């Protein structure tokens, strides 16, 4: 027998849409996320022979990626950036050879990225959708606005509408009902599984404390899913695979050979 490794990536950005401006500071978050994370994942799914991965693409983020005014702004941002890349390959020529070499890496890479974006007529959701169809990728939904549902538990109408709106929003973009859901901050309160069942959701993710602090602890701890009485499967976080392994202060990314974020 083999151990099962379930890697989960949470892909979320708040809905930030400022069509009243031509460049807005907080619309750059989206552009960096597309450039640094979402397209390189796509590139990686294409290049690797085989993978299995589960991820959320929250409804705010689907709604932004599909917005064809943001796609136009991103395309223009990417060109501005490839133009800078070129200015940089010349200006670096007589500076350090590492620095010169990087500038050329940056030119080729940014070109590649904008080209993938074009492959998909600028809707990269189409790319994620295509990997779901293979079964190598599994994409779960999130509540509509990534509200923290335990804050609103006394307002079941807003809670369940948060869920349904997310579910329907996913259906709209993905052309498929979602099977799983990621709750914002894994915020789970007792009874919430019922609404998930009403919404035809098959599985969610909880924090480790959801099992540890249950009336009777699950027999296999966090290393097997449980099923709620309502038939909804819950997957608990392996706390040995926590946030710290990716810490810059104490984990792999803090290695001195890795690219420094805060020099630009």
């Amino acid at each position: 027998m083999r151990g099962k490794i379930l890697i989960f990536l949470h892909a979320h950005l708040p809905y930030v849409h400022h069509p009243e401006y031509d460049h807005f500071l907080e619309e750059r978050w989206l552009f960096e996320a597309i450039t640094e994370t979402y397209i390189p994942l796509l590139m990686m799914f294409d290049e690797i022979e085989d993978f299995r991965l589960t991820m959320s693409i929250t409804p705010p983020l689907m709604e932004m990626l599909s917005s064809r005014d943001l796609q136009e702004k991103y395309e223009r941002h990417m060109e501005k950036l490839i133009e800078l890349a070129n200015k940089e390959v010349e200006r670096t020529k007589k500076e350090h050879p590492l620095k010169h070499k990087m500038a050329k890496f940056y030119r080729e890479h940014f070109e590649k990225i904008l080209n993938v974006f074009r492959s998909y007529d600028g809707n990269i959701l189409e790319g994620f959708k295509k990997y779901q169809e293979t079964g190598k990728l599994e994409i779960v939904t999130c509540n509509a606005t990534h509200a923290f549902l335990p804050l609103y538990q006394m307002y079941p109408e807003v809670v369940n509408a948060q869920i349904t709106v997310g579910v329907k929003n996913y259906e709209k973009h993905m052309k498929k009902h979602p099977r799983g859901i990621w709750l914002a901050e894994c915020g789970y309160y007792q009874g919430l599984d019922l609404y998930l069942a009403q919404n035809n959701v098959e599985y969610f993710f909880v924090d480790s404390h959801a099992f540890w602090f249950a009336d009777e602890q699950p027999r296999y701890g966090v290393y097997r899913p449980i099923m709620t009485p309502s038939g909804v499967f819950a997957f608990a976080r392996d706390p040995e695979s926590s946030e710290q392994v990716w810490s810059a202060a104490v984990g792999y990314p803090g290695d001195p050979r890795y690219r420094e974020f805060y020099r630009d």
Partner: protein, 254 residues
Amino acid sequence: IGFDREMEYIKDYIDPSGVRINTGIKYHRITSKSLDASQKEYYDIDLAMEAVEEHARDFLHKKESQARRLMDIMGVEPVIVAPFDAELFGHWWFEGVFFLKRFFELVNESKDLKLVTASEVIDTLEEVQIATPADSSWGATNDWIYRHLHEMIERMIDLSKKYYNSSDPLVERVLNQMLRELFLAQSSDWAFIMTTRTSVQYAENRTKLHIKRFLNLYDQLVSGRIDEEMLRYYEWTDAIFPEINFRVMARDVI
């Protein structure tokens, strides 16, 4: 009463934010020179009227005295020019228009004095000297704003000449809103204002807001990507001179 009346009483006449503001209904008189505003007595509008009656005759007697002295020194009728900020009458000073009315009626009765408008005087005067006025005003970093103003004016002039003969009504709408944005950024109000509870805050925020709107349109125009929904947004919020024509900026000078 927006500062005095109890919160539950007064809630939906102040700010929707819940913050206390002025309502326009006010019950105290100035009372004295005290710094202790809590010691203020209730407003009596009859005593207030007695004050305007006194003040209006004070001012009358001062203008008659000044007139007579001037006639005697000049040999022609003085025209005494006295400009005030309008809001000083009725707004800063509640009884101001009452004062204005009593002063007019008094001047009307006066044998030393006549009310005139400025166009009456230019239509009536036969001796007037010819002179050239000196640079002046009735007068009372932060230069990111200035170099932006400099570039906006310079660019606005270029484009108005460049598209002087255009018949494209989209380019025209764009150029027309650019000029509005530019003018709106020029308001002296946002610079060394007569802002009551204004504070150099909503003001430099105003200026930069219009600068930014202008640069957005400039960018769309200069690159083929006029964004019609944004332009309509700007036309709506900054709707000032509907009849403007950007071509004013292409005229000769000097």
